[PDB]
Amino acid sequence: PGDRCPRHVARIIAENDPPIRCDLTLQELLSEVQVDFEPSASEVVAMEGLMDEQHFIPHDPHSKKAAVQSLVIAIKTADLLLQMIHENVKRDIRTTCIQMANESYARADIVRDSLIAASQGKYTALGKIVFHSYTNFMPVNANESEKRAWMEMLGECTSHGNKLCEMANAQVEQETRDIINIMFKNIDDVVTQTTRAMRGVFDPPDTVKALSAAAQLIRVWEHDNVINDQSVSTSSVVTAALEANENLAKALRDVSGYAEVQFNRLCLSILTSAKERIDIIYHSARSQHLACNVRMNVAQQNLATFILTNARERPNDAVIRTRRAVANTGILLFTGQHITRDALDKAAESKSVEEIVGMS
Amino acid sequence: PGDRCPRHVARIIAENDPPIRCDLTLQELLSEVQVDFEPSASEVVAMEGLMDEQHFIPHDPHSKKAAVQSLVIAIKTADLLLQMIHENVKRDIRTTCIQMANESYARADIVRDSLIAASQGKYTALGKIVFHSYTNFMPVNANESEKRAWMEMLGECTSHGNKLCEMANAQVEQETRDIINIMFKNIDDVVTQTTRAMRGVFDPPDTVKALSAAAQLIRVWEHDNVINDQSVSTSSVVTAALEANENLAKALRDVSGYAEVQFNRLCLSILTSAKERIDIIYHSARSQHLACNVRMNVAQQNLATFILTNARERPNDAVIRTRRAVANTGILLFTGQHITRDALDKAAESKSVEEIVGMS
């Protein structure tokens, strides 16, 4: 279908074990012949006719037989409704949870595309900073053909610095992907936890007292007392079997009522907080991406002030100090650490690993 | 103080590294003599007097000296304000985060006491179920002195079943504690993540163009041009040094404005979602506790129907089947699994491990 759930998430949604039905089975209540009953059309109308207001004969074995059959039908119907109630509870949860899943993965892609949009953009902050304030670092003498050579030496430092921006774009791409993978993994966990939570809290009222009483009257009347054949008050048996069916109807309406009213309150309180924290998953991923970009912005400024200061103070060693600073601090960039100017200063003191081995 | 933070959480709040100041230092801008300036009272009034509307002499070396000193003071003041702005940003975050921490641990104890309240309550569901419907499982004969022996055999089964309730209380206590430890650990992580997030997003405007220009005029005037001693337009130097100070004031107000207005918007959006998901931590812990209690309620009902069915069908083997069912399924209880009646049925078939070795 249009399902976006991963492999293991659809497994957790597919399972139907957590909501467990603890009601008495038919085999504990009725005989195998009574389970395989399926009454004829006339037998049904005879049962339905007991609810009609009437005066009963002191010995009406036809109506007394319908009173026994009414209990068998009432129990069989009660069991079917209970299964349907449970099967209806499972079905609603899957529909609720799959809908929240697909709704959440949809917005996740919107966030994913939005994060890659800003991460593909190249870092120009270092170039802009030097370009706007390079004049305030030129020497005081400012001879005609002396400033042109200072600008050429500056360009060697700036080109060496843009290699750090190139490293920064490589890192922010890798981090953005790691951010996205955390986001989806989190959404997966929310959907998993939500489905199990709704099932885990389903605690319907028990139906033992209603079922056990109905199966006992059947056991008493059918073979021990043989009430239908002996002279016994028919109005007593009809009144007994009628209140027994209503006790079953009360129990089922009490159970279905819990599923419709009280249990539904729980599932909404779950779904709300589930929906709430998915919204947080989005906002969290966005601020993580922002915080990463801020770390790169910090490094460019520190490099910019490192370049401009060394360009004025040590214009002879500037290009070499810039190269050594960028190479010896780039490892800090890929390890996700910050790049302080103290680190840039102390790094320019040492030779790069590339020039030591001679790889370059 | 009244701090409830754990050991490692107060460490994360105490650190002040993540907000990094990248502004130009005084040593890159001024001479060591200019840093150690501390002007006399008359020198200050001379500087402040340049802003007064007046017509300047074509060569006023007294006012021109104050113009140079005004830049030195303007830079020194700018650096102090920038440090204070950062130190003010760190201070507000700690106050904001410690407050949210203590506010959250307070409600956590309220939840902790509330969960232990319901977990200390003993499980009586199995006893209640049998007590209300035991009559509907007595045999049909119902001889005078035959039902009294059936009740005694039932009591042996019920007492054996209350050992499972005793195991259930042991588990729900252990799980409730595990729930509480997860809750506090989660609150710890939220507080940690919140503090670092606010620091990680602080990205103030740079002050390079404003500082570099002011230090350059000082370098030009002081020793290269010697403007104060040579006949040079005084109104030109005052107008130059006045616009330089205002460029510094604009930059500081632009930086402080970001901290007060734009960065504060970020920290509130963080704090809100931080506060939001802590509320979820509470509601999550409560539903986990509920879902545990539901699993125990399921086991009691399955045992209750297992006891009542075996009491009517197999009253001779009931007590032994009950004992074997409870012992062979109790391991499922402590492993956190559900106790289906199918499991209770299949477990009563095998002897208990205790009766095999003879430990009992």
Author numbering:
A (entry chain R), B (entry chain R): 33 to 392
Quote the study on this structure.
Structural characterization of IE1 has shown that it comprises a folded core domain (IE1CORE), which mediates the interaction with PML and is flanked by a short disordered region at the N-terminus and a longer disordered region at the C-terminus containing a SUMOylation motif and a STAT interaction site. All three IE1CORE proteins display a femur-like structure consisting of α-helices only.
Of the two ratIE1 variants, only the N-terminally truncated variant yielded protein crystals. This variant, covering residues 30 to 392, is from here-on referred to as the ratIE1CORE domain. For crystallization, surface lysine residues of ratIE1 30–392 were chemically methylated. The structure of ratIE1CORE was solved to 3.4 Å resolution with Rwork = 21.5% and Rfree = 24.6%. Initial phases were obtained with the MAD technique since any molecular replacement calculations with the previously determined rhesIE1CORE structure failed. The main chain of ratIE1CORE could be built from residues 33 to 392, and only three N-terminal residues could not be located in the electron density. Thus, helix H1 is significantly shorter in ratIE1CORE, and the position of H2 is rotated by approximately 90° in comparison to humIE1CORE and rhesIE1CORE. Furthermore, a kink separates helices H5 and H6 in humIE1CORE and rhesIE1CORE, whereas ratIE1CORE contains one continuous helix termed H5/6. At the same time, ratIE1CORE has an additional helix H12 at the C-terminus in comparison to humIE1CORE and rhesIE1CORE, which consist of eleven helices in total. However, whereas the stalk and the adjacent C-terminal head region of ratIE1CORE are formed by continuous right-handed coiled-coils, this segment is interrupted by a region of left-handed coiled-coils in rhesIE1CORE and humIE1CORE.
